[PDB]
């Protein structure tokens, strides 16, 4: 008998940690983690998901065979889960990440990585350019704006105080963390996914331009 | 240091030193300007939400771009963005040049890592390319909204010296979009000054941006407000 | 079956008797408390376990009758004698 | 023995300022010729002093023998240094209570396994005053001298080495303004790897004092003669049978219950480290051996590894931790 | 067999100083917790503070979770034990120094000890004190004494010099002992509860700064 | 039954084997005394 709200919740933030879909950066320990695991087993909706954990055991290098009926299954298990969008290449992160936790023996120290070996080749960047922008040339552009069109600035500075005041509550710094972290993971998973090599070199020095400007 | 400064009558020798901390001086000159730095910017940030509204939106951000089809209204917003990042940059001329093209992507393989949005002229005019997808997904993500981000003395010292809906998640949102515009309105600014050649150069490798801009933006940025790192170098590069 | 408690049960009995003692891996830890789940004899070191997480909580007054139950569970699990400070 | 840079390079004779004690014998530790147990002729029924004999070498740069750069709060009613030539002499009051009685590390065998938690405390403390960069070499045994009360446990002078480090990321120049100029503090390269080496190695000296505390026969683990290998001494002695890569501890005659396994270090951890520590023969040429123990290259890290792994299951032999690492 | 009023006054001596409101400090023999416990075990209404102190035999380290009936149930029979103010947070004292002797070893030398494991998150100093401040600023005055209003200051002087003499026959001494090991135990019984790290250090400096004048 | 009296016994045990023969701490003397009020 245990709480089982207590060990949803712990699966939540796990789940919500390794998808590197939410901002916040919280430390989880092996009790998270199997208290995350037993949330998922005991949750008869997400037996599947249970069952791609335990699959996850072995070297999780495959993509598992799963009928397009059984994907609708475990994406609606998740959309439950996570309470939100989110897709395939989401699970694919899960199962990376969560098996990346598996291979690793106890450790005294959280080990920090990247995110790697989701979606075969291994590939760069200037390929990576010149065939986006021959796609992009293939496909025909949308939408057309002309005319020299005026920025809108709001001159009345009544209702421009009142948004500033309605975010003067709001603790900037947390919001350069979460946005600059938000940068960060997406960046990383665009290129990890892409197998491009995410160039954390390069986004260091982003920030030391950012310094330096 | 310390600054000892004389109380003299001259009638007497009657001297009465009364030394002074600099600390406390500068601690009040770095709090105003943070103070100060933080209205500039929420004031640069009520500005741009004022003049996104007087573009008539209904939905949020959010939204917005989870549309599939409307290109009109993501494309407008685009050019709202890039206009505003070009008049407070260069207040001079608070317009974009007259004409332009949109393209929406819509997956991955269109997709590109690093700078999903981007510019390419169609040898006419410059084109955006937009990246929905990713981009969507980058905004329904969740945000440290409920936890505290951060010398311990001198913020401790500053403690005790111390109807549109918008919640704190919307602004770290538009914060958001705000700096990937930035960024890549720094490489459109990249192409327009220096060819499409030194434009891939700067794709590709950002420290050039400082070199690039030293001539420009030091003559400006709000992301240069903070600090900021990668976690753990330490035992990540190892 | 939906997971072969064989190899749950190995890793219990050896990482039990390893720390017993005193190259294993998180997900063996997985298997082991997997198998604790599964074997309702054990269960009752199941609560133990599940207990010690957040804080080290405590261990409930337990029964003669139960302490001695829990011991021949372990026992099986082994064959030496064991008692009460090698279960804390 | 004494020369001089005078064309006719003199005989010096080495006249010795003070009068060495005649009576150079020890209770405490009878074997030692260089303590001096001294019972000060005066709680007072159990008064105490002690002087040991030791060569000038272990003196550093400002005059103060290095062991004593570890003692805070220092429990021992007197301590100082004194010289007599080469020779040097530390000289301890204490006074116990009338109940209450020091005894020698050596072939303590004590089965108190709570006194053996108040020593080891008292060690462990002591050596992490020490500094992360600062290594450290002792040219006696290895391990630490130390005397003991049930009541309190009091280090005893010891063949201490103050050698400091810099981790090219606190600049190697003290000596003052003018006088750096001239001369500088040698520093070596500090590196993550000698540093664990050095953790490790205080590891080792406090495994072999608490194995000096369990043993009721001499401890050769803490032997560093160069006739005997620490090779050879595992060769003939062995590894531990509850585990090959143990050596055979579990089997030595201990004061209380054996430990059996539980005193079985790994093997080459401990090869690997006697040969580093047989570094102190020469301080001064230090990359030879400054981070041997941390040196490779898998096989070593794994090993290194399930040496953490011993070290670790000791301290949670008393609830113990390894920040000390 | 057990004298009752022997065993009787010493648990009450015993949780007397383990509570300490007994600023008075006299020695503590194993004989005189072992009374303590021998009475604990004869007491049916105080059999409920009996298996508490066999909950602090254990790892002492929950929160021992007990419905709200059995809260005011253990705080009557602590009080008619005491005998006197006794709560919650003088129960949670009572178990973690009772778990602390527990846990120490026999020992001919007796030992000094500080008070924690009361009250989930190791709070700065810092952060407590801006939190504090944040309500306080928020928390309106409900009183208020208008100009340097006199001072009634007893010209009495019969009175002066009786009270004088009535305090005379009192050891200075010993109510200065009292006062100060009073705040002591105060301020540190505050850094734990509010589980803010207690600075015995600056808590001497105190004192220092005293001596100095 | 209110205690474990096996635990309480082993320690009772062992402590007073340990003062005739010759590593304890205060626990396990009141549970020792525990034990044998019991007994």
Chains 1, 5 share one sequence.
């Not at chain 1, 989110?86 to 699970?91: A, E, K, M, P, S």
């Amino acid at each position: 008998l245990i709480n089982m709200r207590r060990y949803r919740n712990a699966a939540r933030k796990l789940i919500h940690h390794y998808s590197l879909n939410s901002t916040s950066s919280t430390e989880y320990k092996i009790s998270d983690v199997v208290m995350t695991m037993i949330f998922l087993l005991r949750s008869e909706k997400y037996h599947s998901l249970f069952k791609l954990l335990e699959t996850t055991f072995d070297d999780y290098t495959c993509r598992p065979q799963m009928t397009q009926v059984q994907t609708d299954t475990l994406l609606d298990a998740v959309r439950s889960l996570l309470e939100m969008t989110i897709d395939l290449t989401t699970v694919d992160i899960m199962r990376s990440s969560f098996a990346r936790c598996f291979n690793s023996p106890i450790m005294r120290y959280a080990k920090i990585v990247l995110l790697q070996n989701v979606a075969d080749k291994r590939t760069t960047l200037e390929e990576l350019l010149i065939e986006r922008g021959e796609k992009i040339q293939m496909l025909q552009p949308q939408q057309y704006i002309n005319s020299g069109t005026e920025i809108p600035f709001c001159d009345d500075a009544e209702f421009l105080n009142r948004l500033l005041k309605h975010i003067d509550p709001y603790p900037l710094s947390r919001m350069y963390y979460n946005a600059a972290n938000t940068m960060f993971y997406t960046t990383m998973e665009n290129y990890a996914v892409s197998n491009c090599k995410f160039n954390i070199e390069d986004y260091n020095n982003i920030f030391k331009v950012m310094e330096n400007i | 240091n310390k600054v000892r400064t004389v109380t003299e009558i001259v009638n007497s020798d009657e001297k009465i030193q009364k030394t002074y901390e600099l600390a406390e001086f500068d601690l009040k000159n770095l709090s105003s300007l943070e103070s100060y730095e933080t209205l500039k910017i929420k004031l640069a940030l009520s500005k741009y939400m004022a003049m996104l509204s007087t573009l008539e939106m209904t939905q949020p951000l959010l939204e917005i771009f989870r549309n599939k089809a409307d290109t009109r209204q993501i494309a407008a917003v685009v050019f709202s963005t890039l206009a505003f990042i070009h008049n407070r940059f260069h207040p001079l001329v608070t317009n974009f040049t007259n004409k332009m093209e949109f393209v929406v992507t819509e997956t991955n393989d269109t997709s590109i890592p690093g700078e999903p949005i981007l510019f390419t002229e169609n040898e006419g005019v410059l084109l955006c390319s937009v990246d929905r997808p990713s981009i969507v997904k980058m905004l329904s993500r969740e945000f440290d909204t409920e936890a505290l981000v951060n010398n311990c003395n001198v913020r401790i010292a500053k403690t005790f010296g111390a109807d549109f809906s918008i919640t704190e998640v919307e602004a770290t949102q538009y914060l958001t979009l705000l700096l990937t515009v930035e960024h890549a309105y720094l490489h459109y600014y990249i192409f327009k000054n220096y060819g499409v050649f030194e434009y891939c150069k700067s794709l590709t490798d950002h420290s050039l941006f400082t070199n690039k801009l030293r001539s420009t933006m030091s003559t400006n940025l709000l992301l240069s407000k903070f600090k900021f790192t990668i976690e753990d170098f330490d035992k990540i590069n190892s | 079956e939906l997971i072969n408690m064989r190899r749950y049960r190995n890793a219990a009995r050896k990482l039990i008797h390893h720390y017993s003692l005193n190259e294993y891996k998180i997900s063996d830890v997985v298997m082991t408390m997997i198998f604790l789940l599964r074997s309702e004899k054990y269960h009752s070191l199941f609560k133990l376990l599940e207990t010690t997480f957040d804080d080290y909580t405590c261990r409930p007054q337990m029964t003669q009758v139960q302490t001695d139950t829990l011991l021949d569970a372990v026992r099986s699990l082994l064959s030496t004698t064991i008692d009460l400070t090698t279960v804390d | 023995p004494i020369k001089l840079d005078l064309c006719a390079s003199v005989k010096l004779t080495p006249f010795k300022p003070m009068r060495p004690p005649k009576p150079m014998q020890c209770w405490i530790h009878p074997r030692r010729a260089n303590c001096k147990v001294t019972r000060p002729r005066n709680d007072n029924e159990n008064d105490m002093l002690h002087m040991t004999v030791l060569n000038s070498v272990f003196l550093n740069e400002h005059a103060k023998l290095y062991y004593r750069h570890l003692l805070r709060n220092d429990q021992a009613e007197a301590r100082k240094t004194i010289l007599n030539a080469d020779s040097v002499y530390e000289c301890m009051l204490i006074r116990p209570i009338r109940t209450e009685h020091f005894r020698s590390v050596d072939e303590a065998g004590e089965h108190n396994m709570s006194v053996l938690k108040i020593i080891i405390d008292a060690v462990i403390k002591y050596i992490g005053k020490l500094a992360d960069d600062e290594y450290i070499l002792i040219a006696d045994r290895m391990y630490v001298d130390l005397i003991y009360s049930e009541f309190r446990a009091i280090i005893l002078p010891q063949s201490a080495y103050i050698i400091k480090g810099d981790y090219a990321e606190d600049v190697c120049n003290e000596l003052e303004y003018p006088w750096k100029l001239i001369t500088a503090n040698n520093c070596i390269v500090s590196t993550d790897e000698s540093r664990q080496s050095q953790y490790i190695y205080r590891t080792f000296l406090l495994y072999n004092t608490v194995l000096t505390a369990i043993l009721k026969q001499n401890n050769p683990f803490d032997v560093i003669a160069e006739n005997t290998s620490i090779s050879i001494i595992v060769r003939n002695l062995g590894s531990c049978p509850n585990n090959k890569d143990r050596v055979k501890c579990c089997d030595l005659n201990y004061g209380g219950v054996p430990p059996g396994h539980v005193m079985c270090p790994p093997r080459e951890i401990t090869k690997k480290f006697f040969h580093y520590a047989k570094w102190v023969r020469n301080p001064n040429k230090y990359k030879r051996y400054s981070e041997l123990i941390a040196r490779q290259r898998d096989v070593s890290q794994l090993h290194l590894l399930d040496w953490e792994n011993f070290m670790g299951e000791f301290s949670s032999y008393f609830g113990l931790h390894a920040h000390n690492v």
